[PDB]
């Protein structure tokens, strides 16, 4: 869903977003700030009430102008898994970082699992 | 700085409100409007005094403000901004606290002083008047100020009277005297 | 009047005993506003299916410790 929000705070490397729309991203969902660098993937870790999530932020956290739009991916960061995932070095996010080009994959599975 | 300081949160709001309206030089206007909005809040007990419960949204809070300024269009304008502030800071729940506090600050500016004549049981109206006269006459009431002297009933104070005002007291009571008397004959 | 009607419009309509609306949640510990007939140490059923006992009854926020995962209570 297009739950826009703004970055209420950027305290350390634990950025907090405030999703203005009443629907609030769920805990362990992942959010993307479309940074000038690329994207920053953040993962909702608390709901602080009044529709303000507080998010652990994956990649580098410098340079987030306080108020930059966020958009909700809708689920835990989903890595790509497969038989076609062997022979790769993959980032925390899950993108190929060994420059073998896009990792062909069938199923992308949530990082969190019971 | 505005005469009479108010320590702590919610009274920092009052302090601000007063000094803000003092530079507008429309303090009487503020006071009158504050009484009026407080009164129509108070006189709407269920739904709008008992829906000052802290659980409402940001958007719902804004709409509580919108209903409040719908209820009468006579508001100082500094106090219309104040309504916004309390909502925005989402401390709107303490509404009357700021109102009371502005009142304390305001009537100090007006000059009025408050006293108390605590006694065991209510005292004569003749006594009330004689004490009021004396107290107003005295240098303690500087004059250019008024005294709303209130007898209160406190059974714990056995007989006498205790004059209180300006955080300065004269306590001539039988309970207090008895305490000292007893103590001195236990030596 | 119209003000009272609009106030009625934004009213929660909560039972405030037997129910309450979550107000912050995460870590495992939630806080609900309401539940004003909750017994101390009662088991309270979150409406996404988690069940959690409640161990602190604070002066306005009943603090319910979640027995499940956090990823089911929003």
From Swiss-Prot, chain A:
Function: Mitochondrial membrane ATP synthase (F(1)F(0) ATP synthase or Complex V) produces ATP from ADP in the presence of a proton gradient across the membrane which is generated by electron transport complexes of the respiratory chain. F-type ATPases consist of two structural domains, F(1) - containing the extramembraneous catalytic core, and F(0) - containing the membrane proton channel, linked together by a central stalk and a peripheral stalk. During catalysis, ATP synthesis in the catalytic domain of F(1) is coupled via a rotary mechanism of the central stalk subunits to proton translocation.
Name of the protein in its database record: ATP synthase subunit beta, mitochondrial
Residue range from the parent sequence: 40 to 153 of 511
Subunit (UniProt): F-type ATPases have 2 components, CF(1) - the catalytic core - and CF(0) - the membrane proton channel. CF(1) has five subunits: alpha(3), beta(3), gamma(1), delta(1), epsilon(1). CF(0) has three main subunits: a, b and c.
Record-listed Phosphothreonine modification sites: 73
Organism: Saccharomyces cerevisiae (strain ATCC 204508 / S288c) (Baker's yeast)
Location in or out of the cell: Mitochondrion; Mitochondrion inner membrane
Other notes: Present with 164000 molecules/cell in log phase SD medium.
The gene coding this protein: ATP2
Family: Belongs to the ATPase alpha/beta chains family.
Highest taxon in the source lineage: Eukaryota
UniProtKB/Swiss-Prot annotation, chain B:
InterPro entries linked to this entry: ATP_synth_OSCP/delta_N_sf, ATPase_OSCP/d_CS, ATPase_OSCP/dsu
GO CC terms of this entry: mitochondrial inner membrane; mitochondrion; proton-transporting ATP synthase complex
Pfam families: OSCP
Classification via PROSITE patterns: ATPASE_DELTA
An annotated GO BP: proton motive force-driven ATP synthesis
Primary location recorded for the protein, binned into one broad class: mitochondrion
Signal peptide as annotated in the record: none
Family stated for the protein in its record: Belongs to the ATPase delta chain family.
PANTHER family, sorted: ATP SYNTHASE DELTA CHAIN (PTHR11910)
Record-linked HAMAP family: ATP_synth_delta_bact
Function according to Swiss-Prot or TrEMBL: Mitochondrial membrane ATP synthase (F(1)F(0) ATP synthase or Complex V) produces ATP from ADP in the presence of a proton gradient across the membrane which is generated by electron transport complexes of the respiratory chain. F-type ATPases consist of two structural domains, F(1) - containing the extramembraneous catalytic core and F(0) - containing the membrane proton channel, linked together by a central stalk and a peripheral stalk. During catalysis, ATP synthesis in the catalytic domain of F(1) is coupled via a rotary mechanism of the central stalk subunits to proton translocation.
NCBIfam families with a match to the protein in the record: ATP_synt_delta
Protein name: ATP synthase subunit 5, mitochondrial
Species, as recorded: Saccharomyces cerevisiae (strain ATCC 204508 / S288c) (Baker's yeast)
UniProtKB/Swiss-Prot annotation, chain C:
Subcellular location: Mitochondrion inner membrane
Phosphoserine PTM sites in chain numbering: 11
Similarity-based family: Belongs to the ATPase alpha/beta chains family.
General function of this protein: Mitochondrial membrane ATP synthase (F(1)F(0) ATP synthase or Complex V) produces ATP from ADP in the presence of a proton gradient across the membrane which is generated by electron transport complexes of the respiratory chain. F-type ATPases consist of two structural domains, F(1) - containing the extramembraneous catalytic core, and F(0) - containing the membrane proton channel, linked together by a central stalk and a peripheral stalk. During catalysis, ATP synthesis in the catalytic domain of F(1) is coupled via a rotary mechanism of the central stalk subunits to proton translocation.
Misc. comment: Present with 41500 molecules/cell in log phase SD medium.
Binding partners and assembly: F-type ATPases have 2 components, CF(1) - the catalytic core - and CF(0) - the membrane proton channel. CF(1) has five subunits: alpha(3), beta(3), gamma(1), delta(1), epsilon(1). CF(0) has three main subunits: a, b and c.
Protein name: ATP synthase subunit alpha, mitochondrial
Organism (species): Saccharomyces cerevisiae (strain ATCC 204508 / S288c)
Residues of the full protein shown: 47 to 120 of 545
């Amino acid at each position: 869903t297009p739950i826009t929000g703004k970055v209420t705070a950027v305290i350390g490397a634990i950025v907090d977003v405030h999703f203005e729309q009443s629907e609030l991203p769920a805990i362990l969902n992942a959010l993307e700030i479309k940074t000038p660098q690329g994207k920053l993937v953040l993962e909702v870790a608390q709901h602080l009430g009044e529709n303000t999530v507080r998010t652990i932020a994956m990649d580098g956290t410098e340079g987030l102008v306080r108020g930059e739009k966020v958009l909700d991916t809708g689920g835990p960061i989903s890595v790509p898994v497969g038989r076609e995932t062997l022979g790769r070095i993959i980032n925390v996010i899950g993108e190929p970082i060994d420059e073998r080009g896009p990792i062909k994959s069938k199923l992308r599975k949530p990082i969190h699992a019971d | 700085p505005p005469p009479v300081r108010l320590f702590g949160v919610e009274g920092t709001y009052a302090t601000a409100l007063y000094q803000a309206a003092a530079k507008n030089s429309s303090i009487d206007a503020a006071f009158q409007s504050l009484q009026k909005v407080e009164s129509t809040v108070k006189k709407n007990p269920k739904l709008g005094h008992l829906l000052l419960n802290p659980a409402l949204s940001l958007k719902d809070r804004n709409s509580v403000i919108d209903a409040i300024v719908e209820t009468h269009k006579n508001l100082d304008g500094y106090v219309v901004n104040l309504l916004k502030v309390l909502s925005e800071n989402n401390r709107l729940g303490c509404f009357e606290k700021i109102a009371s506090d502005f009142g304390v600050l305001n009537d100090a500016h007006n000059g009025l002083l408050k006293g108390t004549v605590t006694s065991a049981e209510p005292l004569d109206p003749k006594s009330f008047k004689r004490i009021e006269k004396a107290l107003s006459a005295s240098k303690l009431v500087g004059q250019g100020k008024s005294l709303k002297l209130e007898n209160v009933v406190k059974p714990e104070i056995k007989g006498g009277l205790i004059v209180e005002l300006g955080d300065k007291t004269v306590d001539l009571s039988i309970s207090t005297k008895i305490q000292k008397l007893n103590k001195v004959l236990e030596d | 009047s119209i003000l009272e009607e609009r106030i009625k419009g934004v009213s929660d309509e909560a039972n405030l005993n037997e129910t309450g609306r979550v107000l912050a949640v995460g870590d495992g510990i939630a806080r609900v506003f309401g539940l004003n007939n909750i017994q101390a140490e009662e088991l309270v059923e979150f409406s996404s299916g988690v069940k959690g006992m409640a161990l602190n009854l604070e002066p306005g926020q009943v603090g319910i410790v979640l027995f499940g995962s956090d990823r089911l209570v929003k």
